[PDB]
Design a protein around this nucleic acid. Structure first.
Ligand SMILES: Nc1nc2c(ncn2[C@@H]2O[C@H](COP(=O)(O)OP(=O)(O)NP(=O)(O)O)[C@@H](O)[C@H]2O)c(=O)[nH]1
Ligand SMILES: [Mg+2]
Ligand SMILES: [Mg+2]
Ligand SMILES: [Mg+2]
Ligand SMILES: [Mg+2]
Ligand SMILES: [Mg+2]
Ligand SMILES: [Mg+2]
Ligand SMILES: [Mg+2]
Ligand SMILES: [Mg+2]
Ligand SMILES: [Mg+2]
Ligand SMILES: [Mg+2]
Ligand SMILES: [Mg+2]
Ligand SMILES: [Mg+2]
Ligand SMILES: [Mg+2]
Ligand SMILES: [Mg+2]
Ligand SMILES: [Mg+2]
Ligand SMILES: [Mg+2]
Ligand SMILES: [Mg+2]
Ligand SMILES: [Mg+2]
Ligand SMILES: [Zn+2]
Lengths: 311, 95, 87, 37, 115
RNA sequence: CUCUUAUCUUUAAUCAGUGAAAUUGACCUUUCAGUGAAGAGGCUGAAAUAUAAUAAUAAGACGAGAAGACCCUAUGGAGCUUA
RNA sequence: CCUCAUUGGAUCAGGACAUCCCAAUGGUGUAGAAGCUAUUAAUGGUUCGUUUGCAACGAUUAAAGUCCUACGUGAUCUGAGUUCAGACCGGAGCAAUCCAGGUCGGUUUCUAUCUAUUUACGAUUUCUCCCAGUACGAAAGGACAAGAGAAAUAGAGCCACCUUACAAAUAAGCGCUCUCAACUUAAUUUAUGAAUAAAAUCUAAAUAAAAUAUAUACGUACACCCUCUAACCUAGAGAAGGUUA
């Protein structure tokens, strides 16, 4: 059943491509014309990832946090999350599901009311309220543009929404979202951090799909699912994958998953008499499918940051 | 080697003292034609090994001696319990 | 290629007096059946080592003492000797 | 020995010499006081 | 000859290697001024997300006459302090390791068979 | 790729036959420092220096070519759209 | 009231020194060991990767210097960009079209006429051993010079073995061998001794020494005037050169 995931000797998750650097320059130059800044994030990870530069660099303008992907997360203790987020200095926080337009109406009134309290100086005469959305990759940041684009303007998708990280590269032009308040949105590429804090946060930050999985291997991460999935008690993979009984060993579960999916490779193994190519079950493919089921929410709702939020 | 010697030591400090004394005596005690011997394991904090021309001495702390069990291997050349657990395998296809 | 080159500090391991053969450590420039120039080494270490060697030259006509057919260096293991056992 | 543009004595014991084309202040008591032009 | 990115066979009984894992270990660094690794040369492996030191005890490339050429590139895992990770080695190890400059007595003690 | 290697064919090279092309102010057509417009085989001052081929390299002759690029000009055009 | 657009790499590198390592020294809040600062010196060297479009890291190293040569170098090669003919989104405009906003796609060729150039050298660095776990130091810890041995790289060669070829008598490296002397100096340190009554003072006073990197004084290599029908050659594009009971 294991006790604690081994994290000794593993390295941190460094992704930080060049576009996440040229991008950060454009975002800084765009402060001129931004009334408010919106941070999107993954509801499953309330207190991790969270590129600190956004508060640092973009702290000049008022801020609003929008925890996305709430549908595939456990929000029983949502009240608790707010209490601590209040301690962090994030008075206003929103939970929204982009795909099924949950709670997305409330965002615009709060942005309106939030702006009223602040000053506008050079832009005090402009009648168009332009705000800006930032966050780590694959948090629904581009989707949020479309969900509001339709909810209010009832027009249609305007930003390319994609599963894998890195779809939106550069800081784009404004995208009109509403007509009555005349609210425009600036879409920007996902930035993680120059240096994630801990090996675990970086491991969690890959679970939700924020960083390309091959940078972590997809084998030191599938193991993490089994640990937390069993630890948190969500024994759903057994039924979904028709496993014999609960287990806490990747080599065993991935052996079962691979057989179920009828996937095998021809892999070169090195024995004592010389290299030999032997057909074997796809441990790699099972890890992907095991990861891709979790992320799709069919394995259950999770609260990866638990016992960190309560405290 | 002709002779294999294993001796436990109280602490890391004691281990260094014993190794240094033996090497000092070794140079003094003749061996004028015979070459010199290195002290190995100084980076290690619990196990030091000095290999003379025909004798090898390993000095280690009690726990290190218990884990490695050098005595059993050399006493029981092929019947050591740890060795027994190491089996052989082959590589057949999966069907 | 086809240039004059010199190799420095090659040891002499053995001399065959009957066939006038010299055994020189390592490689020598040129192809087989190529003529070479042999002279005492000019390196600093062996500055005045020709004290022991025949100073003008080796005269066989003098016949002061008749040389063995094969001359060896002490470290050399000669064939027909007992097999080496590093006891 | 610091190579400075102006040489100035710093204590009573410091003395001056003209060696190898340059001016030196050399102090036996305090070697810190040594300067070259 | 072992280089960067070579695939290696851990010949200990240590759990780090012994445990069957879909990926073999791959060399990340060779501790030499020459990039190549031969018998007795340490290397840094990437084994199951972990970076671990190791020592080469045999390889498939030919060597000088009277030395044994193995059929697999054999390696032993050593701790950072230099003590071997595993406690036993049942595969033959060449006797050249004794005289090579370095610390090999600890590994030789753990090895029962010598070739 | 580490880190290249060997062989064969093509081409190359030598012999025989046939025989183009862009290009070309004149040339008895050197190196260094200076001067100069980013600039010198040719100017200033030092220096070097028997004469002609054959086979190689491409630093230079701001090397040679094409209807290439870029900005601006004309009381020069043309296609397209309109309110 | 707003604004905004040549440079990487590969190959081969020439040079500056404002020195990153290697070498010789002054000072210290330099006990030793680690360091800090400055002088002197251009000697050879100054790694491999990952994400990258500029950085961001990993593992090493004695060190991974800073610059100049029209990105040093495209008639040596290559990726961007400038930047277009097609096409989409976002934002403009009544439209055609447009944006120094995104993106995907997307043809520069050259036979070298001239200059210039194409046939030797006398080695750098690192680790281990010893001195010696000593000198020093309360302990912790822990040297220098002197001396011996290993490799790495570079340069020059070779084929007995090994390996890979020609399913040839050969060529290669993944194999093997060899690599050194310093007359001449700079920072700096001594000895003798005047200007200057010293039992002072290293001296752009007369003097005597020691002391980096450099280098060619000093060596090795070369050295012969050379028949040629032709054949042969471990010599070669041709010519040249070697060999011929
Ligand atoms: N289940 C679920 N999936 C969502 C939700 N919002 C977005 N997604 C998923 O997330 C992906 C889209 O991410 P996107 O909206 O482009 O976000 P981004 O952060 O702007 N992308 P990038 O990584 O390029 O920065 C798709 O796989 C989409 O289905 C949501 O509320 N629920
Ligand atoms: Mg002809
Ligand atoms: Mg002329
Ligand atoms: Mg000039
Ligand atoms: Mg002139
Ligand atoms: Mg011709
Ligand atoms: Mg030219
Ligand atoms: Mg006009
Ligand atoms: Mg007109
Ligand atoms: Mg150079
Ligand atoms: Mg200097
Ligand atoms: Mg050119
Ligand atoms: Mg050409
Ligand atoms: Mg068109
Ligand atoms: Mg393209
Ligand atoms: Mg195509
Ligand atoms: Mg394009
Ligand atoms: Mg030519
Ligand atoms: Mg010494
Ligand atoms: Zn003074």
């Amino acid at each position: 059943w294991r006790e604690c995931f081994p994290l000794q000797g593993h390295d941190v998750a460094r992704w930080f491509p060049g576009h996440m650097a040229k991008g950060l320059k454009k975002m800084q130059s765009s402060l001129k014309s931004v009334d408010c800044v919106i941070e999107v994030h993954d509801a499953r990870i309330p207190f991790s990832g969270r590129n600190p530069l956004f508060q640092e660099l973009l702290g000049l303008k008022p801020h609003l946090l929008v925890l996305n992907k709430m549908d595939l997360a456990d929000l029983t203790e949502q009240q608790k999350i707010v209490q601590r987020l209040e301690e962090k200095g994030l008075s206003n926080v929103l939970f929204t599901n982009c795909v099924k337009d949950e709670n997305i109406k409330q965002i615009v009134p709060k942005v309106m009311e939030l702006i009223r309290c602040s000053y506008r100086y050079h832009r005090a005469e402009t009648p168009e309220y332009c705000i800006m959305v930032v966050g780590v990759p694959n948090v629904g940041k581009s989707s949020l543009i479309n969900s509001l684009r339709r909810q209010h303007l009832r027009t249609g998708k305007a930003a390319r929404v994609g599963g894998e990280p890195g779809i939106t590269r550069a800081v784009t032009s404004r995208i009109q979202v509403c007509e009555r308040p005349l609210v425009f949105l600036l879409d920007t590429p996902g930035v993680l951090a120059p240096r994630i804090e801990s090996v675990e946060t970086g491991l969690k930050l890959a679970l939700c799909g924020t960083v390309l999985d091959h940078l972590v291997g997809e084998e030191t991460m599938a193991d993490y699912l089994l640990y937390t999935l069993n630890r948190h008690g969500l024994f759903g993979y057994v039924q979904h994958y028709a496993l014999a009984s609960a287990c806490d060993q990747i080599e065993w579960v991935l052996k079962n998953v691979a057989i179920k999916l009828r996937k095998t490779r021809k892999v070169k193994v090195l024995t004592g008499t010389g290299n030999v190519n032997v057909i074997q079950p796809d441990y790699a493919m099972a890890a992907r499918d095991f990861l891709r089921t979790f992320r799709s929410g069919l394995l259950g709702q999770v609260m990866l940051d638990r016992d960190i939020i309560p405290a | 080697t002709d002779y294999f010697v294993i001796g436990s030591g109280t602490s890391t400090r004691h281990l260094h003292a014993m190794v240094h004394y033996l090497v000092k005596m070794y140079k003094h005690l003749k061996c004028r034609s015979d070459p010199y011997v290195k002290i190995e394991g100084k980076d290690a904090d619990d196990w030091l090994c000095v290999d003379f021309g025909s004798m090898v001495i390993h000095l280690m702390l009690p726990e290190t001696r218990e884990t490695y069990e050098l005595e059993k291997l050399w006493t029981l050349r092929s019947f050591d319990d740890q060795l027994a657990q190491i089996a052989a395998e082959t590589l057949p296809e999966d069907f | 290629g086809n240039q004059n080159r010199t190799v420095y500090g090659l040891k002499v391991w053995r001399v065959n007096t009957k066939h006038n053969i010299i055994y020189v450590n390592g490689s020598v420039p040129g192809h087989k059946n190529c003529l070479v120039k042999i002279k005492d080494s000019t390196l600093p270490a062996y500055k005045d080592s020709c004290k022991n060697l025949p100073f003008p030259t080796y005269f066989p006509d003098g016949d002061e003492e008749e040389l063995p057919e094969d001359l060896f260096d002490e470290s050399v293991w000669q064939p027909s000797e007992p097999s080496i056992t590093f006891a | 020995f610091k190579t400075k543009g102006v040489i100035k004595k710093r204590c009573k014991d410091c003395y001056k010499v003209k060696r190898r084309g340059r001016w030196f202040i050399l102090c036996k008591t305090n070697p810190k006081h040594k300067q070259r032009q | 000859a072992v280089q960067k990115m070579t695939r290696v066979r851990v010949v200990d009984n240590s759990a780090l290697g012994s445990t069957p894992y879909h990926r073999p270990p791959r060399c990340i660094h060779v501790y030499n001024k020459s990039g190549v690794g031969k018998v007795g040369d340490q290397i840094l492996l990437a084994i199951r997300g972990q970076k671990k030191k190791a020592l080469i005890v045999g390889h498939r490339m030919p060597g000088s006459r009277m030395t044994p050429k193995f059929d697999s590139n054999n390696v032993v895992l050593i701790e950072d302090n230099g003590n071997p990770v595993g406690t036993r080695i049942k595969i033959p190890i060449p006797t050249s390791l004794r005289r090579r400059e370095g610390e090999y007595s600890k590994v030789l003690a753990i090895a029962q068979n010598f070739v």
